[PDB]
Amino acid sequence: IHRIRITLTSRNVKSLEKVCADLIRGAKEKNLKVKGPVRMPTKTLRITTRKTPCGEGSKTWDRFQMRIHKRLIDLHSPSEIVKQITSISIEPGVEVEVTIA
């Protein structure tokens, strides 16, 4: 079997891109094929709430946005190198799900 999908996600795009470059460079340094970083659409969680803690005042709202950036990367490689690369002490703020399909 040579079908492995790794899901990368984070709120911060800097860490996401750095860890994606880490994974791609780790895959390509050793003789191995790897797909490009599929870039899934960003999810914009929107919540609007009145600023005031009471009923008085002009109706001014707060629009809190929360951006979730997620990527999927394919891998045709033995599971050993995948497990070694996954345990590379990734940067904080990034959630990773390595799936062996």
């Binding site: 109706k59 001014t60 709202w61």
Partner: protein
């Protein structure tokens, strides 16, 4: 065959697939001559056929622009025609022909090819719309 010029107006999804043959544009299964709006026909058919019918027999183009709205695929078809012709005559004829066909396609359209980033604008709290509020103060 790669020319890499496309045709894109507004946000319509378009494809310009090039391989030698006649230049035809398919819109909802309706080719270039018989068009979907059925009311802007002359404004799109005038530039090509009055000069020649075999004029488009150079390189066939799959143009399947799934455009909704008449201002969307109309003038997108002519964008595609001009862009495909200019790129084909650019890469695969010579520079002098480039100059003359660019001159005729520029007297076709001086400078309106590419626009600024704008669309329908956002809505603000305190009113029903983008720039509007609740009951009036006279």
């Amino acid at each position: 065959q790669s020319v890499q010029v496309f045709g894109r107006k507004k946000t319509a999804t378009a494809v310009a697939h090039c391989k030698r043959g006649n230049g035809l544009i398919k819109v909802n299964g309706r080719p270039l001559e018989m068009i979907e709006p059925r009311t802007l026909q002359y404004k799109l058919l005038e530039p090509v056929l009055l000069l020649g019918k075999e004029r488009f027999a150079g390189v066939d183009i799959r143009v399947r622009v799934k455009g909704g709205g008449h201002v969307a695929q109309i003038y997108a078809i002519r964008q595609s025609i001009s862009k495909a012709l200019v790129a084909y005559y650019q890469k695969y004829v010579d520079e002098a022909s480039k100059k003359e066909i660019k001159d005729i396609l520029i007297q076709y359209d001086r400078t309106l090819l590419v626009a600024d980033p704008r669309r329908c604008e956002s809505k603000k709290f305190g009113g029903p719309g983008a720039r509007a509020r609740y009951q009036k103060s006279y």
